[PDB]
Amino acid sequence: YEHVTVIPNTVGVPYKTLVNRPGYSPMVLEMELLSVTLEPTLSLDYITC
Amino acid sequence: KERGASLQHTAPFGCQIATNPVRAVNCAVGNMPISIDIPEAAFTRVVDA
Amino acid sequence: PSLTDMSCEVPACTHSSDFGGVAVIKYAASKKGKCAVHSMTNAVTIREA
């Protein structure tokens, strides 16, 4: 079963989602972001000193 | 002597800045789609519940 | 045997073409014994005889 959800990027705040698959008991999952990193690609132009 | 405040102190959305490598951490911006493929073994039938 | 105070409930039903439906029937039996089960419609086939 493929379950698709969207959560806020706020870190340290858990969110719950309900999975509805007929014929089966409802399932609840909990997701929390512990860390989100944005790593830029850099190219050196020059060194000054 | 005149560098002023660094990006880790002035950045929007509470972004944490680190070097080596240069990266931004835990910026509270936007949202993040998540898709989970859940195996049938993970499900309990309504007759079992 | 004879049965009274009978009622039926359906935890779930899927028309998967492979006995995807389940039904539970409550009964009060006059005595211990065996009975025979048959559908009264041609739209629904019951696996157990």
From TrEMBL, chain A:
Domain of life, source organism: Viruses
Cellular location(s): Host Golgi apparatus, Host trans-Golgi network; Host cell membrane; Host cytoplasm; Host endoplasmic reticulum
Subunit composition and interactions: Homodimer. Homomultimer. Interacts with host karyopherin KPNA4; this interaction allows the nuclear import of the viral capsid protein. Interacts with spike glycoprotein E2. Interacts with host IRAK1; the interaction leads to inhibition of IRAK1-dependent signaling.
Biological role: Provides the signal sequence for the translocation of the precursor of protein E3/E2 to the host endoplasmic reticulum. Furin-cleaved E3 remains associated with spike glycoprotein E1 and mediates pH protection of the latter during the transport via the secretory pathway. After virion release from the host cell, the assembly protein E3 is gradually released in the extracellular space. Acts as a viroporin that participates in virus glycoprotein processing and transport to the plasma membrane, cell permeabilization and budding of viral particles. Disrupts the calcium homeostasis of the cell, probably at the endoplasmic reticulum level. This leads to cytoplasmic calcium elevation. Because of its lipophilic properties, the 6K protein is postulated to influence the selection of lipids that interact with the transmembrane domains of the glycoproteins, which, in turn, affects the deformability of the bilayer required for the extreme curvature that occurs as budding proceeds.
Protein name in UniProt: Structural polyprotein
UniProtKB/TrEMBL annotation, chain C:
Cellular localization per UniProt: Host Golgi apparatus, Host trans-Golgi network; Host cell membrane; Host cytoplasm; Host endoplasmic reticulum
Subunit-structure text: Homodimer. Homomultimer. Interacts with host karyopherin KPNA4; this interaction allows the nuclear import of the viral capsid protein. Interacts with spike glycoprotein E2. Interacts with host IRAK1; the interaction leads to inhibition of IRAK1-dependent signaling. The precursor of protein E3/E2 and E1 form a heterodimer shortly after synthesis.
Function: Provides the signal sequence for the translocation of the precursor of protein E3/E2 to the host endoplasmic reticulum. Furin-cleaved E3 remains associated with spike glycoprotein E1 and mediates pH protection of the latter during the transport via the secretory pathway. After virion release from the host cell, the assembly protein E3 is gradually released in the extracellular space. Acts as a viroporin that participates in virus glycoprotein processing and transport to the plasma membrane, cell permeabilization and budding of viral particles. Disrupts the calcium homeostasis of the cell, probably at the endoplasmic reticulum level. This leads to cytoplasmic calcium elevation. Because of its lipophilic properties, the 6K protein is postulated to influence the selection of lipids that interact with the transmembrane domains of the glycoproteins, which, in turn, affects the deformability of the bilayer required for the extreme curvature that occurs as budding proceeds.
Name of the protein this chain belongs to: Structural polyprotein
Residue range from the parent sequence: 1103 to 1151 of 1248
